[PDB]
Nucleic acid binder design. Structure first.
Ligand SMILES: NC[C@@H]1O[C@H](O[C@H]2[C@@H](O)[C@H](O[C@@H]3[C@@H](O)[C@H](N)C[C@H](N)[C@H]3O[C@H]3O[C@H](CO)[C@@H](O)[C@H](O)[C@H]3N)O[C@@H]2CO)[C@H](N)[C@@H](O)[C@@H]1O
Ligand SMILES: NC[C@@H]1O[C@H](O[C@H]2[C@@H](O)[C@H](O[C@@H]3[C@@H](O)[C@H](N)C[C@H](N)[C@H]3O[C@H]3O[C@H](CO)[C@@H](O)[C@H](O)[C@H]3N)O[C@@H]2CO)[C@H](N)[C@@H](O)[C@@H]1O
Ligand SMILES: NC[C@@H]1O[C@H](O[C@H]2[C@@H](O)[C@H](O[C@@H]3[C@@H](O)[C@H](N)C[C@H](N)[C@H]3O[C@H]3O[C@H](CO)[C@@H](O)[C@H](O)[C@H]3N)O[C@@H]2CO)[C@H](N)[C@@H](O)[C@@H]1O
Ligand SMILES: [Mg+2]
Ligand SMILES: [Mg+2]
Ligand SMILES: [Mg+2]
Ligand SMILES: [Mg+2]
Ligand SMILES: [Mg+2]
Ligand SMILES: [Mg+2]
Ligand SMILES: [Mg+2]
Lengths: 62, 90, 254, 50
RNA sequence: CGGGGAAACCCAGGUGGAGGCCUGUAGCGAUGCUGACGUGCAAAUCGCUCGUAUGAUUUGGGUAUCGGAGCGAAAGACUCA
RNA sequence: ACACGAGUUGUUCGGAAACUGAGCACAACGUUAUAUCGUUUUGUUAGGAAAGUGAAGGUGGUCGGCCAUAACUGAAAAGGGGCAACAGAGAACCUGGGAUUAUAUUCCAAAAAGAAAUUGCAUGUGGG
RNA sequence: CCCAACUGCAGACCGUACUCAUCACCGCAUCAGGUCCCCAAGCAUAGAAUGCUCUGGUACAUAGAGAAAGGUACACUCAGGGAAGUCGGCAAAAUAGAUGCGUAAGUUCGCAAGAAGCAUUGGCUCUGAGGGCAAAAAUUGCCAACUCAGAACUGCUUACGGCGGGGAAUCCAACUGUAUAAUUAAAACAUAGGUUUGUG
RNA sequence: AGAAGACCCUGUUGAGUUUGACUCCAGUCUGGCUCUGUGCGGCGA
RNA sequence: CACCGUCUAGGUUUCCGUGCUGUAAACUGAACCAACGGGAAGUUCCGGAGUCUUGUUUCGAGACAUCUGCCAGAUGGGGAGUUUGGCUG
RNA sequence: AGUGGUAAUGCGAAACACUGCCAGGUAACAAAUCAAUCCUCCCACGGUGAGCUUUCUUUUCACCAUAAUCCACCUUGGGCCUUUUACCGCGUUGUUCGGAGCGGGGGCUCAAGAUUGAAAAAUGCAGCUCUACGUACUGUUGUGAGUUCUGCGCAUUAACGCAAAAACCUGGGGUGU
């Protein structure tokens, strides 16, 4: 209680809570798991618009 | 040298408890203190902590299951059944 | 002339459970809106032993549905449950080991555990170590699922009652002999006061109906009626048949 | 020992101030009745147990 | 670590420190002398001998269960001589 | 033993203030001809409106758009009180003394024999 | 208004003596009974065994004088015989540490087992091994702390304390454990193991 | 000496325990009405 | 007996759907105290965040008993009270 | 509106200032083996006093002390980083470890100590010397044995898996903007 904050923490994120091998394993999965959904979200909107000209292009075919 | 003939870990108990109840306990006292295969981490390192609790000494993975052996033979029958039944829905 | 020991355990004084080192009650998470319509995902953080069970527990971490917090949930684990697993929980959850989904959604012939006998009571059937229920059929007119309990006794339950998928963890336990009265001391240490077990014939006639005599014999026939009073109902209570069961294996129960 | 409540210490303090003899001039009054104290408590013979 | 073998596996020297293991203090009990004492040191004690002594072990404080009731590894034992 | 006279000194030591445990049972509710009865920690009372605390802002005397001090409005905190451990938790003081007939990690006074640690509140100096 | 280092002032309540036991508590009492915790020296020795000793404590438990018979002992011996004593080897005797060798039937192969049974042991003077850290370093320097084996020489009156007697079978209970405080500790009870019943 | 025989018997004296003794009582079960309402019917008299 | 009115809207899907933005073996991240927009920088009022209540907290059972109270009968050493003649070499 | 180092992570006179809400950690528990701290015992060095002396004994006995609290920072056990990549190697009395990164080379840290200092000689003890609880001076090793403090735990036999909470600590997010 009487000590400075520096004997109980360290200068980076989650310092004094998490270690160096798992601060980085959260930085890496905060990037790779967010970006994996962006690949699957933009794949989903690209599929529904290809449906929007697979059948709306059949208005000029019968 | 070789220290006993056929009482292995059960030589702990001496001339007690009957020959065959030492032998039913022998296959499961050997099994729970043997290190099993960490399929997560590739190593032979699963040691049982408490009853039903296993822990890869290389991978620090804690797996529930099996009182004296890591995977009981009724589990692998179940894992195949769940894997088959999720293929019929996809 | 004095009160029988089996009648005395219902006062529950020296004979209550030994629960100080127990964790909380193991149950499924609350059947909220988030499972009646979607799935909640959790994550297994620890596999736990409490005193007086042979099955492993698990703390699964959900997010609270309505508040900025996370809910620690103590479930009893199936076999193969590892820390990190991402349990899914609800209607739209897939069919995998560890997931908890309604019995209407689990296709037939599937091994389930922590099945609940009415919707919402958070798991009452198949929770001892190594046990499981098998789903036999579904009825869509009545909306009920009929499954085989671990005794073999069938039971029809509503198809909105959910169940976890798997064997209960910690199985194979009874197959090792105890070998010692010391090892039975510590087995019943975290349970309750019910050991050592003194036979009724070893007692005096004041304590038990079987006690007394010059030879240790039960005098009267030891199969008592269903309608015997407390104190008189000791022995083989309402035995339909006795003796060494020579033949098949009848399911026991009403 | 060392622990006592103060309400037990103040009862043990009253009995020390009662454990004193009859003075001599009591024995010289007119309608005298008292020779000795009849309530002289000794710590070994009879116990207060406070 | 050494040795034998085509292999299955056997054979030896250490290492290690398992056990309701053994001898044996303290502790906890109480076998025999049918010892001493038996208006005692004592309304149950003394002496030597004996049981056990890592365990179903011993123990303090705190708590909870009682009168036709309590508690009991069960002797109708124990519940302030 | 008896009579008489004395003797126990604390910011830090033990307790309480101020922890929780096995448990207890006040309120509430139910019961009972009768409360002297039951429930009352598996997260936790009571058919069960037991929070009197207050984020942010508005109102108008203070310190260089931040504070801080005074009175209206209202986000957010489900789950009433109190006990139970002088061996568990917690806990800021250590020596020296020629200082007693008897107390001391308790008394020692300007060279405190002295050396500290800690809590509350306050000035001044200095910094934003 | 925030903060630092300092300073200035104040730091409340209760306990505190003595005991904790062969005299301070409980057993009617200054009762050989019981009663939780901490500190814990030297030598012999495996040693919280047991014997003796510096520190601390004590000489307090009615004493004196003193060869009866009879007793009681945490006291001894006893020639020849050696359980003939006796319900019964009850009581005593005997065995004994350590080291080397050796060990049967039976067996759940773990044991039985310290089976049984043999041998050695002193004192003294030496000789071998078993190491460190300081500069073919495969060797020159210096040095602690002990243990074991061997060897001559010499002595025994077998000489502290402490410390299994052993074997062949029969009965019963598997085992360690519990158990009639104050006449029964057992073969009883418990136990693991086996079975049954009720129960979704 | 110890102590109104702990054996035995007597008493219209007990008490612990037992049970197809005698008289009952809780408990368990079973029937009746009740709590107990709303519809479409069916077997009945 | 007809009609009207209460009675409105909607993720996804090529009318269906039935309240929906995430997963379809699983491998330990994050998520709060509203951004933004409209209609009349600060207010007020809306949307974001659908509206509606012949009302039940929600699910299951349901006039059963898994409820309540009285009668009625079987059982009933679990327990209570009491008794267990007399004469008598 | 904190800031260094590739990184393990560093830097505190007063802004590296504050905490509706959230999440962690501390409190917080565990064998045996080996190594073992304070301290005790012994041995070795000596100094002071005392005891023995027909003989012997470079001799026997006593004493030789350093409290908290600071301050500055050589070992031997943990964790890790970076660089070389290694599939036999490192290591323990001991049941094992390594491409999921061994071993070397450089490091960063943590824990237990050691050391220099402030306290502290002014104190303590035993001697002794001088004209009254008086004074002036003199003195202040150990590869021995025992030590649970520690190393020490996701830590014991286990169908035994080993309390809780207050109080506190750090972060996330926000404010400062
Ligand atoms: N991979 C290295 C190998 O080591 C080998 O060395 C091994 C052999 O020389 C030798 O093997 C022996 C052998 O004598 C003989 N022919 C057969 C015997 N089984 C082996 O014995 C070996 O295995 C037994 C287990 O049974 C162990 O007890 C023991 O440790 C070991 N000696 O002992 C060594 C193992 O420790 C050879 N050098 C060669 O094959 C090769 O270099
Ligand atoms: N149930 C009524 C009670 O019967 C008791 O007396 C009864 C008992 O003495 C005795 O009951 C016995 C019972 O002891 C014994 N252990 C079992 C036997 N089944 C019973 O028997 C009685 O009950 C069954 C019906 O269940 C009848 O078949 C039978 O006729 C009848 N004697 O038979 C008597 C007739 O019932 C008591 N007199 C009294 O408590 C009360 O009347
Ligand atoms: N009201 C008296 C109380 O009833 C309770 O005891 C009752 C229960 O033990 C027991 O209840 C049983 C129940 O266990 C069982 N599962 C279902 C059965 N319906 C009930 O039975 C009871 O309840 C119903 C209620 O209407 C009555 O119809 C029936 O007559 C009655 N015997 O019957 C007993 C008599 O009612 C309490 N245990 C006790 O404190 C007390 O005697
Ligand atoms: Mg023994
Ligand atoms: Mg009897
Ligand atoms: Mg006096
Ligand atoms: Mg005494
Ligand atoms: Mg002879
Ligand atoms: Mg009767
Ligand atoms: Mg240790």
């Amino acid at each position: 209680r009487l000590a400075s904050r520096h004997e109980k923490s360290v200068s980076r994120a989650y310092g004094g809570v998490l270690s160096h091998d798992q601060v980085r394993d959260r930085v890496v999965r905060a990037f790779l798991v967010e970006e994996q959904r962006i690949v699957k979200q933009a794949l989903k909107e690209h599929s529904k618009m290809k449906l929007s000209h697979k059948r709306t292009a059949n208005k000029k075919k019968s | 040298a070789k220290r006993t003939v056929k009482m292995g870990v059960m030589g702990r108990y001496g001339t007690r408890y009957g020959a065959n109840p030492r032998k039913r306990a022998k296959k499961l006292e050997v099994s729970q203190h043997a290190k099993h295969f960490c399929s997560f981490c590739g190593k032979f390192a699963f040691r049982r902590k408490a009853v039903g609790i296993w822990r890869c000494d290389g991978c620090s993975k804690t797996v529930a299951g099996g009182a004296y052996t890591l995977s009981t033979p009724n589990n692998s029958t179940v894992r195949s059944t769940v894997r088959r039944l999720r293929e019929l829905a996809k | 002339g004095k009160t029988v020991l089996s009648c005395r355990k219902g006062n529950g004084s020296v004979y209550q459970v030994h629960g100080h080192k127990r964790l909380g009650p193991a149950k499924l998470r609350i059947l909220d809106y988030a499972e009646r319509h979607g799935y909640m995902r959790g994550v297994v953080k620890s596999i736990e032993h409490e005193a007086g069970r042979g099955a492993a527990l698990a703390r699964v971490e959900f997010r609270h549905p309505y508040k900025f917090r996370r809910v620690k949930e103590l479930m009893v684990a199936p076999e193969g449950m590892f820390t990190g697993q991402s349990v899914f929980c609800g209607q739209k959850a897939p069919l995998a080991i560890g997931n908890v989904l309604p019995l209407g959604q689990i296709t037939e012939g599937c091994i389930v555990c922590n099945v609940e006998a009415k919707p919402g009571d958070r798991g009452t059937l198949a929770r001892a170590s190594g046990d499981y229920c098998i789903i036999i059929s579904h009825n869509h007119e009545t909306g009920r699922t009929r499954l085989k309990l671990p005794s073999g006794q069938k039971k029809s339950v509503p198809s909105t009652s959910r169940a976890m998928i798997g064997i209960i963890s910690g199985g194979g336990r009874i197959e090792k002999p105890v070998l010692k009265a010391g090892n039975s001391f510590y087995r019943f240490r975290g349970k309750r006061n019910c050991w050592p077990k003194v036979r009724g014939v070893a007692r005096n006639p004041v304590e038990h109906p079987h006690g007394g005599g010059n030879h240790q014999h039960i005098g009267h026939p030891s199969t008592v009626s269903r309608h015997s009073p407390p104190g008189q109902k000791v022995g083989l209570i309402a035995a339909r048949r006795t003796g060494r069961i020579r033949g098949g294996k009848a399911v026991k129960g009403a | 020992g060392r622990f006592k409540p103060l309400a037990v210490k103040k009862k043990y303090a009253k009995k020390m101030n009662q454990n004193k003899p009859v003075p001599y001039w009591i024995r010289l009054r007119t309608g005298n009745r008292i020779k000795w104290n009849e309530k002289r408590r000794h710590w070994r013979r009879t116990k207060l147990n406070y």
